[PDB]
Recover the amino acids of this structure.
């Protein structure tokens, strides 16, 4: 009264519509271009959400730019994983109410590769039966899970914020169960999924950056994603990325 | 027109925008 997890619940971005036209047969171009446009709108919701996260607007504006530019795909993939889990038991990729990627759509050329990585996040969320509260704390933690090699400007403050959300996730795990050995075992399992997201997003961005730089594919990108991708392409090499892991 | 400091970044514009 008020908990940080109830604040996260209030600020959780709404499920947006794709604006997909289903009165014309499917094609990979139409689906990927639509998911790109929808993706730019999801990035906007994520920035608006980050601004309401207690502690974030205390970081310097360059750190705020930095974390969103590094974490945007982690948020989208994780929230897609959550929706696909609750709505289909991780069988369908529930991008938008008007655009579900079912078995048929996955078989479309170029589709399956990016899809399997998304279905892995949802498979894991399903297999661990992640609760709403654990999901909200995990998602905040994914915004604070990658920083530059040399660090952020508000480093001590960033460390305070991340610790706050590591403790919120702890409380959501305790509330869900209440057994001390099973508590840390569940913390281990949830935190393992957070760690494994680094590789999921590394594969998502490697295909995403290939599609963005591909002159032949002609797949469109929204202006918001076009600018983040322009920055993050040189950030992968030389590697100015420090993964903040819970295990290793 | 007068000199301005309009922000070119869409991300930075979203981060500065109220409220
Ligand atoms: C940029 C990528 N483009 C490429 O990879 C490419 C193909 F162009 F190269 C694009 O990524 C995504 C990834 C998730 C996406 C979207 C659009 N909606 N959702 C989504 C759904 C549910 C919740 C949230 C979410 O963010 N929710 C809240 C808001 C803020 O926080 C919480 C976001 C686009 C992509 C394009 C086509 C794909 C694809 C991936 O994977 C499957 C095969 O087709």
């Amino acid at each position: 009264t008020p908990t940080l997890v109830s604040l996260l619940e209030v600020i959780e971005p709404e499920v947006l519509y794709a604006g997909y036209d289903s009165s014309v047969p499917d094609s990979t171009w139409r689906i990927m271009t639509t998911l790109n446009m929808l993706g730019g709108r999801q990035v906007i919701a994520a920035v608006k959400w980050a601004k309401a996260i207690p502690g974030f607007r205390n970081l310097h504006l360059d750190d705020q730019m930095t974390l969103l530019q590094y974490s945007w795909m982690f948020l989208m993939a994780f929230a897609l994983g959550w929706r696909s889990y609750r709505q289909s038991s991780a069988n369908l990729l529930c991008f938008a109410p008007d655009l579900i990627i079912n078995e048929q759509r996955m078989t479309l050329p170029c589709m399956y590769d990016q899809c399997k990585h998304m279905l892995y996040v949802s498979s894991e969320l399903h297999r661990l039966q992640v609760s709403y509260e654990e999901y909200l704390c995990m998602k905040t933690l994914l915004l604070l899970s990658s920083v530059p090699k040399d660090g952020l400007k508000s480093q001590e403050l960033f460390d305070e914020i991340r610790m706050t959300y590591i403790k919120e996730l702890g409380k959501a795990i305790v509330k869900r169960e209440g057994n001390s050995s099973q508590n840390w075992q569940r913390f281990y399992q949830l935190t393992k999924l957070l760690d494994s997201m680094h590789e999921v997003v590394e594969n998502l961005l490697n295909y995403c950056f290939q599609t963005f730089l591909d002159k032949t594919m002609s797949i469109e990108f929204p202006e918001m994603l076009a600018e983040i991708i322009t920055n993050q392409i040189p950030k992968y090499s030389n590697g100015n990325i420090k993964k903040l892991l819970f295990h290793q | 027109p007068p000199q301005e400091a309009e922000e070119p970044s869409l991300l930075k514009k979203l981060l500065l925008a109220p409220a």
Summary: Residues 10-16 of chain B form the longest helix (7 residues).
